[PDB]
Design an enzyme around this catalytic site. Structure first.
Site, short mmCIF file in Angstrom:
data_model
loop_
_atom_site.label_atom_id
_atom_site.label_comp_id
_atom_site.label_asym_id
_atom_site.label_seq_id
_atom_site.Cartn_x
_atom_site.Cartn_y
_atom_site.Cartn_z
N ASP A 1 -27.06 -6.49 -10.13
CA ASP A 1 -26.38 -7.24 -9.09
C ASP A 1 -26.36 -8.73 -9.42
OD1 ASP A 1 -25.22 -6.25 -6.44
OD2 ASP A 1 -26.29 -8.04 -5.77
N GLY B 1 -26.85 -6.82 -1.81
CA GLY B 1 -26.63 -8.22 -1.48
C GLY B 1 -27.84 -8.90 -0.89
N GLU C 1 -28.31 0.77 -7.16
CA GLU C 1 -27.02 0.46 -7.75
C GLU C 1 -26.65 1.34 -8.92
OE1 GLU C 1 -26.82 -3.73 -8.46
OE2 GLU C 1 -28.56 -4.16 -7.20
N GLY D 1 -24.20 -4.75 0.33
CA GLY D 1 -22.90 -5.19 0.78
C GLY D 1 -21.97 -4.03 1.11
#
Ligand SMILES: [K+]
Ligand SMILES: [Mg+2]
Ligand SMILES: [Mg+2]
Ligand SMILES: [Mg+2]
Ligand SMILES: [Mg+2]
Ligand SMILES: [Mg+2]
Ligand SMILES: [Mg+2]
Ligand SMILES: [Mg+2]
Ligand SMILES: [Mg+2]
Ligand SMILES: [Mg+2]
Ligand SMILES: [Mg+2]
Ligand SMILES: [Mg+2]
Ligand SMILES: [Mg+2]
Ligand SMILES: [Mg+2]
Ligand SMILES: [Mg+2]
Lengths: 75, 128, 190, 50, 467, 116, 160, 53
Positions: free
Chosen positions: E163, E132, E155, E81
């Site tokens: 996530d 995402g 991440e 994202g």
RNA sequence: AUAGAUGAGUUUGGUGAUGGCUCUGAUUGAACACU
RNA sequence: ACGUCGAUUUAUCGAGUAAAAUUCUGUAUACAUAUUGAUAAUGACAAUAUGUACAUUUGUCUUGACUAAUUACGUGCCAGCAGUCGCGGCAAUACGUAAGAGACUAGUGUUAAUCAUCAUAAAUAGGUUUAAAGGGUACUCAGA
């Protein structure tokens, strides 16, 4: 001709379920399968006695029932 | 036909068809009176055979037509005032009319028991 | 039970597989009867072509055609040939066809129209028999080009089978086709 | 028209309707063909589309 | 959420592009194409607000029988994202931080809808799938990998944590492969995603167009249960399988797979790294000296705070529900916006593009964090300032309802051994039959029988090693 | 079809006149059509006039004929409703076969069908 | 002009009759109007303009056409995706009404009658599956859309 | 009254259920009907004059 | 004004078309025949 | 009238609940009375209401198929029937008689006419290779 319509159905449903699927209604399994399964499928949502036909052909001579001399005989 | 061809008047009435009784159909009359000019016999065409009783009549309008005498036996002759109605003998050319049997001078079949209205026969009045 | 003392229904009792007493409950009616003639080396040979329709009155109609020198055998042939050719015909509310259908059989065009309830079978003399046997009660018909008795019945039979399926039209277009009369009354008002 | 009307792709749609109801009105429909349920969830492929 | 409550909740905020997502409707097929190839189809508030109303709408129609989500370009499916944008907002005072929490609210509302969707959901992983993009697929019953698939969760490298619910999918993965893929942020490519278990099927990218045309031809009956619908689509996907490669072997399997289970079973990062050091030490019997050495070089290059928080929820996520996860992740991700690592890692790796050297986390390394420290305790305390995430529905479940379409993992092999008398070779065949000869079953089952299967009674029977 | 029993006709009359209940309530209580409830009162009022005018009723003809027709005694023993009170007239417009193409996820209600 | 819509109606039939996946139409302001109505009605799959050769089917929707200037306007063309379901085309018939020789204009009071299977003027009632497209001020709508928007206009063609 | 109702329906918003259930038509094909002059017309004319020579 | 749209006999050795004719329905400011 | 008539299988098939007979009504109409048409006054003529009283004709077409309805005898391509196809040449369901049957009814048939049938001059809405019907040709003013 007339059509019977109970208020219980109208209060709960607004006719949307009748258009489910492709506009005609949710399809049900064929009869040769319901007899096979043990549990019966849920009943369809609609008015009571909403699948029996009406005898339009037998109202040909209805106008004669309006005469005064006939009404005296039918009474 | 294109819309233009129709604008210029391409749609015309159909060619008229001849009537069974022109003398009556032309003037919109159901029957006419005529003076019998000749009472003879006409022979049917190929299939049919016999002697059909006809009558050359000169209508009141002036036309000279040939009418068919229905029934068995007539009492008309030269200079007989008879009533002509539409109709046609399907096997006799030129015989395009009929004669009313309860007419002025033409009498009805006296020995007729069925369809007396078609031959101008009064009821026998047996009991009466 | 002695219903078929001639043996004509025995051969048919196996194909469709139902009692002979149940074959007599089917609505049969001779529609066409032609007197055809074949010129042979031994002179004319006149035959009797007949077309018979069979239907139970609840959505099944069969069309059969046969011929023979005897008028009696020609009707029994088509009768047996029509009972085994029965097919389900879709009918809207068990009273009329779905929408409109126009079929053509060699210069004989037939146009069937669906009509509201109480309209009646305002159709010709041959369509009345087919509709009365298939279970239809409200319909309108019209012969556009020709009125051949045979092709008239063939076109009408192919029209009752070529009705627009309202569900196949929905999946194809990706859009619902709601039965307004069903939603209005809350069900199929037969 | 030397060809013939081949309806091989609609054998299920046709067989499914003929087996939905009974010809003898007033009785339940008999059991369908043994193959009607086998290919119930295996529709044909789209043919004749350039 | 009716058609009106959805349209008002997902209004087209100023700035949203008109053609961010490209929707399509075939006979029985409803497609979703993330149209942003310039940015590798990166999700954002604009796209999420266009997909949620549609999915809710197609859920009310019985004509839509199969949903498909895919990317636009030939390189990426959904490459994370707009994380770089949230970093800027976080540097605009509390008013800007709440905007980030709002974005994660929409994202979690969508992923939950996809996890509890009432219709078959397919995901064409024809490209890199990160961030995402991992949320739109892991919760769906079907995840089609291809030769171009590149799965990863980068991440922990940006100071962030796992996530939208990978914290619910990873804990219940076979063995301890879940936490490994999360902490280390490994990179799985192609068929390796199919073997690992993330993807349920593996087709060539050239056979995806033909698969769609088939999914549209399928017309199920309204009285069919969801189990029947998913089975008809499972057998349809297996028809376009061209076979897994002949040379590529299972990457995480055998030795490397055993090491993951021996070094990621503890509850403290200090012990995990301590165990890896033993493997990397020459002379060990594991045989993963090269792998263990590479894993350490990556663990000492990530934010030590995320590692503690990450591993913390991997142990807790094994008991949370699908819906409880999003609610906790929202309150958890809401506190990461206030942290120093996230705002630093993102700026130092995405906005600055690695400039000004590597990232500089607030704690230099895990060694600084004393043993008594429990930094992984504040990110699990929902604050009253952040409202509880309101999901679009109340559907939930502890275990996935339909997640047994992929290759057979240890759980399946165990169930078979504990309910039968199969041998070494006769057990492998039992799966090739039940799975209708699915590609890779012989190689996957054999691997499971090479790590947790002991030839106790000989060729007569086979038992597990744990005992 | 059953006809209102003699004693039942009075129950309907006394409820609308003495208790002054609305005809709609009495129509829905006993499942009798409002058109029939109004006729029962009109015919009953003519009886009061005859009884008031000392006129002889057709009692011998009433008792014998009522034994030839089915009856429905109202009150306690109400086995079935006298008749359907919600029968709707089939309008000619609502008899047409219409298949309106709408969205796949539309909530087509009775209001929308009436407009179609 | 209306001659283009007539050619478009015939070609779309010939293409469906030949069971073709793709179909080309001259790129005009009028053709794009009816095409969007057929697509909005659910008869065709997609509409994308391109050169004399059809776009890449794999990326039909994602196709990014180049700008239409005077240097290529003479070669552009509208590529339509036809639909076929249940061994039967979805756009079987496209019978036109308004021809170059005569333009048929219908009123709101008449479309309301044609929308329920009742003839009005030079038109006929619509039966199950049929569809009528009308060119009005609000674009080329469907008789049921124009009836909802309470407008009349020019009748283009009837689709079965 | 008949004028406002007739004008309110012609400028009403599309049904939501019919906005969320329609395939996407790219604006480049449904709204780019204007055909501007070739920006490089003056350049192509000069180059085409050399080649023709 | 939303119930309103219907066919039959007859060309051919025969079939299918084409195209007329006639009957079926309603009516008259009607006439005539038998009443 | 536990009679009569026509068929025939003396008991079958009909006339036949038909009739007679009995019990009621008082319809059109007749008569009487009253009101009204008209009001400032004027009623040629009649309507309406009420009371009382009376139970009054059958006729006509069709009967091969279209088209609902049958046999017998006579006639013998003769006499005649017929809207169309057709019937009649010595065992004619088609003619003429007798009986039965089908139907309308103070009307019933026939003739004449008009609309519809007929998309059978097609604006809506036709058609022209072999069936009525493509001009010998295409440059072209008007015109579409
Ligand atoms: K992609
Ligand atoms: Mg002749
Ligand atoms: Mg007689
Ligand atoms: Mg006679
Ligand atoms: Mg010849
Ligand atoms: Mg003809
Ligand atoms: Mg009197
Ligand atoms: Mg005076
Ligand atoms: Mg007869
Ligand atoms: Mg002849
Ligand atoms: Mg005779
Ligand atoms: Mg009179
Ligand atoms: Mg020539
Ligand atoms: Mg010349
Ligand atoms: Mg010449």
């Amino acid at each position: 001709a007339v059509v019977n319509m109970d208020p219980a159905y109208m209060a709960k449903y607004n006719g949307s379920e009748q258009a489910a699927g492709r506009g005609s209604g949710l399809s049900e399994p064929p009869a040769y399968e319901k007899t096979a399964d043990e549990k019966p499928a849920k009943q369809v949502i609609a008015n009571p006695g909403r699948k029996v036909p009406t005898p339009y052909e037998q109202m040909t001579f209805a106008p004669l029932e309006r005469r005064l001399d006939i009404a005296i005989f039918r009474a | 036909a294109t819309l233009n061809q129709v604008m210029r008047g391409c749609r015309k009435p159909q060619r008229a068809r001849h009537a069974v009784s022109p003398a009556l159909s032309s003037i919109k009359s159901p029957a006419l009176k005529g003076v019998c000019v000749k009472v003879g016999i006409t022979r049917p065409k190929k299939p049919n055979s016999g002697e059909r009783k006809t009558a050359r009549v000169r209508l009141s309008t002036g036309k000279v037509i040939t009418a068919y005498i229905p029934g068995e036996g007539h009492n008309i002759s030269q200079h007989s005032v008879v009533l002509v109605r539409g109709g046609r003998a399907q096997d006799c050319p030129g015989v395009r009319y009929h004669l009313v049997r309860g007419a002025l001078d033409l009498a009805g079949v006296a020995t007729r028991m069925s369809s007396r209205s078609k031959y101008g026969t009064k009821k026998p009045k047996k009991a009466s | 039970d002695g219903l078929d003392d001639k043996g004509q229904y025995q051969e048919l009792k196996k194909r469709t597989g139902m009692s002979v007493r149940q074959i007599l409950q089917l609505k049969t009616k001779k529609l066409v009867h032609r007197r055809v003639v074949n010129q042979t080396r031994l002179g004319k040979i006149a035959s009797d072509s007949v077309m018979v329709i069979a239907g139970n009155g609840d959505g099944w109609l069969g069309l059969g055609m046969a011929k023979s020198v005897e008028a009696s055998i020609a009707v029994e042939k088509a009768t047996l040939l029509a009972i085994q050719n029965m097919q389900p015909i879709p009918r809207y509310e068990n009273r009329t066809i779905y929408g409109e259908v126009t079929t053509k059989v060699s210069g004989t065009i037939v146009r069937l129209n669906s009509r509201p309830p109480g309209f009646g079978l305002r159709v010709s003399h041959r369509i009345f028999e087919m509709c009365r046997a298939a279970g239809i009660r409200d319909l309108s018909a019209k012969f556009l080009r020709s009125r051949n008795p045979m092709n008239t019945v063939k076109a009408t039979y192919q029209a009752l089978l070529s009705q627009p399926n309202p569900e196949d039209l929905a999946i194809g277009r990706g859009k619902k086709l709601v039965d307004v009369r069903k939603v209005y009354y809350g069900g199929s008002v037969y | 028209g030397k060809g013939r009307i081949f309806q091989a792709a609609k054998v299920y749609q046709r067989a499914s309707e003929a087996a939905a109801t009974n010809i003898v009105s007033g009785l339940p429909p008999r059991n369908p063909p043994l193959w009607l349920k086998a290919i119930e969830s295996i529709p044909p492929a789209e043919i004749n589309t350039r | 959420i009716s058609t009106q409550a959805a349209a008002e909740l997902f209004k087209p905020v100023e700035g949203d592009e008109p053609e961010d997502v490209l929707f399509n409707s075939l006979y029985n097929l409803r497609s979703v194409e993330l149209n942003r190839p310039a940015k590798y189809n990166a999700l954002n508030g604009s796209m999420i607000r266009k997909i949620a109303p549609r999915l809710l709408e197609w859920e009310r129609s019985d004509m839509a029988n199969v949903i498909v989500i895919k990317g636009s370009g030939e390189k990426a499916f959904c490459a994370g994202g707009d994380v770089a944008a949230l970093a800027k907002q976080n540097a605009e005072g509390p008013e800007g931080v709440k905007k980030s929490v709002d974005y994660f609210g929409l994202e979690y509302k969508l992923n939950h809808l996809i996890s509890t969707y009432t219709r078959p959901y397919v995901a064409f992983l024809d490209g890199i799938t990160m961030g995402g993009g991992v949320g739109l697929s892991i919760h769906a019953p079907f995840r089609i990998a291809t030769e171009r698939t590149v799965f990863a969760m980068p991440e922990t490298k940006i100071g962030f944590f796992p996530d939208v619910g990978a914290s619910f999918f990873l804990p219940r993965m076979p063995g301890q492969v879940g936490p490994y893929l999360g902490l280390t942020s490994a990179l799985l490519k192609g068929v390796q995603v199919y073997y690992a278990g993330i993807a349920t099927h593996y087709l060539h990218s050239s056979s995806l167009p033909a698969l769609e045309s088939r999914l549209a031809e399928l017309t199920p009956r309204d009285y069919w249960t969801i189990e029947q619908r998913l089975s008809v689509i499972n057998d349809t996907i297996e028809e376009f399988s061209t076979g897994v490669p002949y040379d590529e072997n299972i990457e995480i399997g055998g030795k490397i797979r055993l090491a993951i289970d021996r070094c990621f079973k503890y509850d403290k990062i200090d012990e995990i790294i301590a165990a890896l050091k033993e493997e990397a030490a020459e002379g060990a019997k594991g045989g993963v000296q090269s792998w263990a050495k590479n894993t350490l070089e990556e663990l000492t290059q990530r934010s030590p705070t995320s590692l503690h928080v990450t591993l913390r929820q991997m142990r807790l996520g094994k008991s949370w529900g699908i819906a409880h996860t999003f609610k906790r992740e929202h309150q958890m991700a809401a506190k990461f916006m206030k942290s120093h690592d996230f705002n630093e890692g993102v700026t130092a790796l995405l906005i600055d593009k690695g400039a000004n050297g590597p990232a500089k986390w607030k704690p230099a390394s895990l060694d600084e964090i004393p043993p008594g420290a429990n930094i992984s305790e504040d990110y699990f305390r929902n604050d009253p300032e952040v409202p509880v995430l309101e999901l679009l529905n109340d559907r939930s479940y502890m275990q996935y309802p339909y997640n047994k379409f992929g290759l057979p993992n240890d759980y399946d092999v165990k169930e078979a051994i504990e309910k039968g008398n199969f041998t070494r070779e006769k057990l492998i065949d039992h799966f090739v039959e039940t799975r209708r000869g699915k590609q890779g079953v012989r190689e996957a089952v054999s691997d499971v029988l090479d790590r947790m299967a002991v030839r106790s009674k000989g060729t007569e029977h086979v038992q597990w090693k744990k005992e | 079809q059953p006809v209102l029993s003699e004693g039942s006709r009075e129950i309907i009359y006394q409820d609308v006149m003495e208790k002054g209940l609305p005809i709609k309530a009495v129509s829905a209580k006993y499942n009798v059509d409002v058109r029939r409830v109004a006729a029962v009162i009109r015919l009953k009022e003519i009886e009061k006039r005859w009884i008031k005018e000392y006129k002889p009723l057709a009692r011998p003809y009433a008792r014998a004929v009522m034994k030839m027709l089915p009856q429905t005694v109202l009150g306690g023993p109400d086995q079935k409703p006298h008749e359907s009170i919600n029968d709707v007239h089939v309008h000619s417009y609502t008899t047409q076969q219409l298949f309106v193409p709408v969205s796949e996820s539309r909530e087509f209600t009775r209001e929308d069908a009436a407009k179609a | 002009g209306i001659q283009q819509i007539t050619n478009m109606c015939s070609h779309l039939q010939n293409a469906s009759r030949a069971r073709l996946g793709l179909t080309s139409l001259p790129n005009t302001k009028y053709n794009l109007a009816l095409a969007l109505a057929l697509h909005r009605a659910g008869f065709i799959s997609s509409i994308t303009r391109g050169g004399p050769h059809p776009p890449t089917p794999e990326a039909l929707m994602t196709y990014e056409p180049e700008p239409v200037t005077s240097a290529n306007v003479a070669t552009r063309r509208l590529w339509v995706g036809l639909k076929y379901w249940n061994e039967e085309p979805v756009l079987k018939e496209l019978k036109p009404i308004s021809k170059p020789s005569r333009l048929v204009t219908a009123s709101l009071e008449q479309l309301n009658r044609v929308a329920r299977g009742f003839p009005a003027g030079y038109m006929k009632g619509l039966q199950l599956g049929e569809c009528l497209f009308v060119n009005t001020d609000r674009g080329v709508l469907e008789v049921r859309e124009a009836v909802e928007r309470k407008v009349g206009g020019l009748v283009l063609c009837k689709v079965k | 009254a008949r004028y406002l109702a007739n004008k309110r329906a012609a400028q009403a918003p599309e049904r939501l259920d019919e906005v969320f259930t329609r395939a996407t038509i790219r604006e480049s094909t449904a709204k780019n009907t204007f055909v501007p002059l070739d920006p490089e017309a003056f350049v192509k004319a000069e180059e085409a004059r050399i080649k023709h020579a």
